[PDB]
Amino acid sequence: HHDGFQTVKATIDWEHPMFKLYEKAKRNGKWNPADIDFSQDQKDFASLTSEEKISALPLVAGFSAGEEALTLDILPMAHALARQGRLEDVLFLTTFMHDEAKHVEMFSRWQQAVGIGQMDLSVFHNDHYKRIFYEALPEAMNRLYADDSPEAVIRAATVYNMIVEGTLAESGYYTFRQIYKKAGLFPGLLQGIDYLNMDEGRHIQFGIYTIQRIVNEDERYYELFIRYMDELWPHVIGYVDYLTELGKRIDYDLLRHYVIKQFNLRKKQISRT
């Protein structure tokens, strides 16, 4: 039941940082996956040999499931914040959810255009990927439906925004650029990564804001954050190591360093105070 409603008793808190992020989202989130021209990606992918074709599919496999997972699995967080009456957070999170929807859309349109929609790409999800995306992500998020304690929220934001988005996805978009922008391939996909990467800059700020406002209330949660971050690293690097051993069948060692740098960069964006 609703006790009452903030916009009948008062107003939106116009100064709230998440309301300010919501405003920037509507401003900067107008791109439409449907408007991306994929006709050259179609040609590029066709003129690839069968061996140069496989090279692209693992990254794509991780993005398409990842974004679909991201779209489904933000709903518990939106629910938990709404129940706590953090209305500006909810407003913003509508833009987050609809961004992820566009992310899933873009990757699927790409698959359709280049002619692999009928192909099952689950075979490039190794155990470590499954542990993050099939299991640890929805488990941490669905927890919020019955346990919205600071500890559960910090863990949801850590898995979702700091590890999946902030470490894995940031690194894979960097990687996709590294490899394909230089080879001059898949411009429609690269336009779409570009849009996606701008969206995700907002998503991470919500994750930082959420972890930090929980840390601010009790510095003991800073150690929970660092700990959960470290608990997921083995699967982060286990997914990375698997992708490397596939591509090795392109400086993998400067991609591996970027994943590590991203991981440590996220850590340093939360302070104990």
Q: Detail the residues annotated as belonging to a binding site for Mn(2+).
A: 67, 100, 103, 128, 165, 200, 203
Instruction: Out of 240, 263, 266, 270, name the contact with ligand DAO by CB under 6 A.
Output: 240
Does position 165 interact with Fe ion (CB under 5 A)? The reply is yes
Are the beta carbons of 78 and 97 closer than 8 angstroms?
yes
What is the identity of the amino acid at 192? Answer: G
Report DSSP letters for 89-143, one per residue: HHHHHHHHHHHHHHHHHHHHHHHHHHT-TTS-GGGG--HHHIIIIIIIHHHHHHH
Does position 252 interact with ligand DAO (CB under 6 A)? The reply is yes
Nearest distance in Å: CB 141, Mn ion:
14
Instruction: Out of 100, 105, 148, 170, name the contact with Mn ion by CB under 5 A.
Output: 100
User: Out of a second copy, ligand DAO, Mn ion, none, which partner does residue 175 contact, by CB within 5 to 8 A per kind?
Assistant: ligand DAO
Nearer to Fe ion, 188 or 207 (CB): 207
**Other C-beta atoms lying within 10 Å of the C-beta of residue 157:** 26
Does position 243 interact with ligand DAO (CB under 6 A)? The reply is yes
* Binding site members for Fe(3+): 67, 100, 103, 128, 160, 165, 200, 203
Q: Which secondary-structure segment (H or E) carries 184?
A: none
Residues 222-241 within binding reach of Fe ion (CB under 5 A) = 238
* Binding site members: 67, 100, 103, 127-128, 160, 165, 200, 203
Give the sign of the dihedral formed by CA 47, CA 50, CA 51, CA 53: positive
Q: What is the DSSP code (8-state) at residue 33?
A: G
User: Out of Mn ion, a second copy, ligand DAO, none, which partner does residue 14 contact, by CB within 5 to 8 A per kind?
Assistant: a second copy
Nearer to ligand DAO, 226 or 237 (CB): 237
Q: What does the block give as tokens for 244? A: 């490397």
User: What is the Cα–Cα distance from 200 to 194, expressed in whole angstroms?
Assistant: 10
User: Out of Mn ion, Fe ion, a second copy, none, which partner does residue 9 contact, by CB within 5 to 8 A per kind?
Assistant: a second copy
**Other C-beta atoms lying within 10 Å of the C-beta of residue 18:** 23
3-state SS of 36-100 is: CCCHHHHHHHHHCCHHHHHCCHHHHHHHHHHHHHHHHHCHHHHHHHHHCCCHHHHHHHHHHHHHH
Of 5-13, 36-44, 46-54, 239-247: span binding ligand DAO (CB under 6 A): 239-247
Instruction: Out of 33, 66, 76, 166, name the contact with ligand DAO by CB under 6 A.
Output: 66
Nearest distance in Å: CB 171, ligand DAO:
4
How distant is the alpha carbon of residue 186 from its chain centre?
21
The 46-65 site mask, x for binding ligand DAO (CB under 6 A), equals -------------x--xx--
Residue 61 neighbours by CB under 8 Å, 6+ apart: 121, 122, 123, 124, 125
Using CB under 5 A, list all residues that contact Mn ion: 67, 70, 100, 103
Using CB under 5 A, list all residues that contact Fe ion: 165, 200, 203, 238
